[PDB]
Amino acid sequence: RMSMVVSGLTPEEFMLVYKFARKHHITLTNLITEETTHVVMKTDAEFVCERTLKYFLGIAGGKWVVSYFWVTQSIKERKMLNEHDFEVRGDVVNGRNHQGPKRARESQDRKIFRGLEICCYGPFTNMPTDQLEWMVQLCGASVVKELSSFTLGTGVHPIVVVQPDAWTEDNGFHAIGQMCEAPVVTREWVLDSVALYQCQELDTYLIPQIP
């Protein structure tokens, strides 16, 4: 039961949480795992946070992604308040009230990446490629590792995800087509879809491919 993770907190705020986790006997730690039940995000007064890896994974796993205000206010009323009353409402990129967290929780029966095959191809900054994979997994996708490896039939949609600025300042990936028939999209297609917890159209994320 109850296992916390923190994101965007200074060491200082981390202690108020430790003091809070101590009292209520919650397993508080630095690394986000499969046993984690809550992701506590630093937010503004309106429960909007910035997008960190933990934010994406908290959503993907259908965990409680709650404002750090849940801790401070509980600490204030000496009693552990309801997570729902402090759930993150959105972020600085995809919308302030998109309700992605709550949608992830209420959509565990219908994962957005359901029936999709995705290969995180290429280099990736600030987010280990293995994390980006676990993220598409938790969201229901099937992970591939090898461009020429995708499943060849019609009950499955293959997707190639890349971070264009994670290589150089000369081109070379408008050529991933020559290695498959799968559409290639920037990593933003995953981040946006996951944050809003709604599979997005590939259109604005498509990367022009040579023949």
């Binding site: 630093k42 997008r51 890896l53 600085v92 990593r187 933003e188």
Partner: peptide
């Protein structure tokens, strides 16, 4: 908002 060493993804 975020005040940790944790990277943020607000663009690419």
């Amino acid at each position: 908002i975020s005040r940790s060493t944790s990277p943020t993804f607000n663009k690419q």
